[PDB]
Amino acid sequence: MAHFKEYQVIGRRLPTESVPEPKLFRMRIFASNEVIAKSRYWYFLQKLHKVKKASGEIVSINQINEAHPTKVKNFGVWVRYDSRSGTHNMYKEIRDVSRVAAVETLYQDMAARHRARFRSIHILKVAEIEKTADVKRQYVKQFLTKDLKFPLPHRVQKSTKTFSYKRPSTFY
């Protein structure tokens, strides 16, 4: 469950004599590695089609890197999660430089704010919003203001030594 990567996993049913060349389904999977990526692919493909890992195969695994990794984007992540007493759909809006970093932020966010583990999260969709004012959350819209500036009061300075001779300051 490390620093996530996005995987382009394509799989299909095993071809038979009656119906060769099956429909060859594809999913985008956020996972720490390819082993989890294949496992997550089969899990979600169990929810949709009459298939399983024994009766199918994986034809392609491909890591998907960010097209523009070093430009800041606003992401709208649809997510379906299980709480202690029910399943809910919610929408989160995340501002960061990559889909993997946005998804990593949401896993931290859902665990912190809803105690929803990676176990009980279904990433419904990650879709970057192209235009400002189509953003819906005030906690990310406030960072899209013209000529945004802010200070960092009360800087805390770490000291290698256990004793200090100065009684330091928190200026910044």
């Binding site: 009061p153 009360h154 805390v156 300075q157 000291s159 256990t162 004793f163 009684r167 330091p168 928190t170």
Partner: protein, 197 residues
């Protein structure tokens, strides 16, 4: 690295400073704490006064004289925090506790010795701004410590003499910095500058 390290207790969280002091004594360092009346505890005054009353009610039922001892002074409150982070029942623990002196205010000879702080334990560096805290002197007087006034009185007399001493030191370091200011641009000064000094 000093033979004796004097820690000015003001602005220090009690459990974070005493955990620092506990490791120093067990590592062989002599530690002296001053101004323990100015120590701090996270949480409201009433919350900390309630925790001391939960401590106050703990006593040996059949004889209160042989029971837990509820020391009211801030230096002894600090000492009780230290014990619990020191295996005080062993010979090594008693040797570590022999390396510590705590004081209300700054008595002699520590008045004219350099005091240090522990940024690893400072309230202004560890607490989040907007979090209520408590001063040990106010807490101690609320539970029966009898010498807040005389400590405050004798600290004022010490601070007046200390301020007068610093003025006679501000003047001397002003003259020393002026002599160093005119020493520049000489042959020796430019060689030291190229050598980082």
């Amino acid at each position: 690295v000093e033979p004796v390290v004097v820690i000015d207790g003001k602005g220090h969280l009690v459990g974070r400073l005493a955990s620092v002091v506990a490791k120093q004594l067990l590592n062989g360092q002599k530690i002296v704490v001053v101004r323990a009346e100015e120590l701090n505890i996270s949480g409201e005054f009433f919350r900390n006064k309630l925790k001391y009353h939960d401590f106050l009610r703990k006593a040996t039922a059949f004889n209160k004289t042989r029971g837990p001892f509820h020391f009211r002074a801030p230096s002894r409150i600090f000492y009780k925090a230290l014990r619990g982070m020191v295996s005080h029942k062993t010979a090594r623990g008693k040797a570590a506790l022999e390396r510590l002196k705590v004081f209300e205010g700054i008595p002699p000879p520590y008045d004219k010795k350099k005091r240090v702080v522990v940024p690893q334990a400072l309230r202004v560096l560890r607490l989040k701004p907007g979090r209520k805290y408590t001063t040990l002197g106010k807490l101690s007087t609320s539970v029966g410590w009898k010498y807040e006034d005389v400590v405050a009185k004798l600290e004022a007399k010490r601070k007046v003499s200390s301020a007068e001493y610093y003025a006679k030191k501000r003047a001397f370091t002003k003259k020393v910095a002026s002599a160093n200011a005119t020493a520049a641009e000489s042959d020796v000064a430019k060689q030291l500058a190229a050598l980082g000094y």
